[PDB]
């Protein structure tokens with residue numbers, strides 16, 4: 001996603017934290033001036049500016065392109081050296097949960113988990129390798145040139161002309177998605193990447209022409225918005241497992 005999609009995933013999740021996860025998230029955020037779950041959500045995309053070395057190391061962590069393999073993930077083939085979103089989200093979830101680490105280490109992991117649960121719910125972050133997740137599929141959207149990747153990351157969301165405060169309650173108004181009955185931080189990333197890949201391959205998501213407009217928005221913007229809600233609910237369920245496992249006896 002672009003920055004707004006990332007912040008909205010985090011805003012959906014933030015309100016769904018259990019009291020233990022609320023307190024631990026707040027404690028980690030308090031170590032960095034002005035940090036909220038939402039404000040840190042775009043951080044991992046900003047590393048060319050903020051941390052070039054980490055930026056180069058983590059660039060591949062934002063996606064996993066499995067559509068040519070019919071959305072069936074295989075770590076050795078699709079994720080050599082762990083350099084993809086499935087294995088990165090698993091590892092950052094483990095790091096985040098490791099209470100023996102420093103606040104700085106666990107806050108960095110939190111930044112990645114918040115971002116990556118967003119990205120693993122963006123269809124075009126789990127799509128074709130051969131066109132770089134739709135980045136190479138250039139098209140006209142209304143009167144403006146873009147590409148299929150950017151259309152899904154932000155172009156459709158931008159059609160609402162809402163700031164986060166306007167967009168958030170719209171996402172919250174949707175029918176609740178059915179989640180897994182339990183969080184499994186090591187197994188759910190693959191599930192989510194494969195589901196996102198299947199959307200990238202759904203009929204019409206790749207349009208039959210290179211000139212689209214309101215018909216495309218009206219059909220697929222609801223699905224992008226459903227994916228933001230789902231990502232936020234899945235992020236809260238994951239943080240509740242990693243950071244909120246005990247109320248009594250914490």
Ligand SMILES: O=c1ccn([C@@H]2O[C@H](COP(=O)(O)O)[C@@H](O)[C@H]2O)c(=O)[nH]1
Nearest residue numbers: 058059060061062063065124125132133
């Ligand atoms: O197939 C691709 C290629 C790139 N990216 C996004 O673009 C960023 C920059 O990739 P690159 O142009 O530096 O390889 C990645 O971190 C990722 O967020 C994708 O989502 N899918």
Ligand SMILES: [Zn+2]
Nearest residue numbers: 001002006119
């Ligand atoms: Zn993104």
Ligand SMILES: [Zn+2]
Nearest residue numbers: 001002149153
């Ligand atoms: Zn993207």
Ligand SMILES: [Zn+2]
Nearest residue numbers: 001045062119
């Ligand atoms: Zn990203």
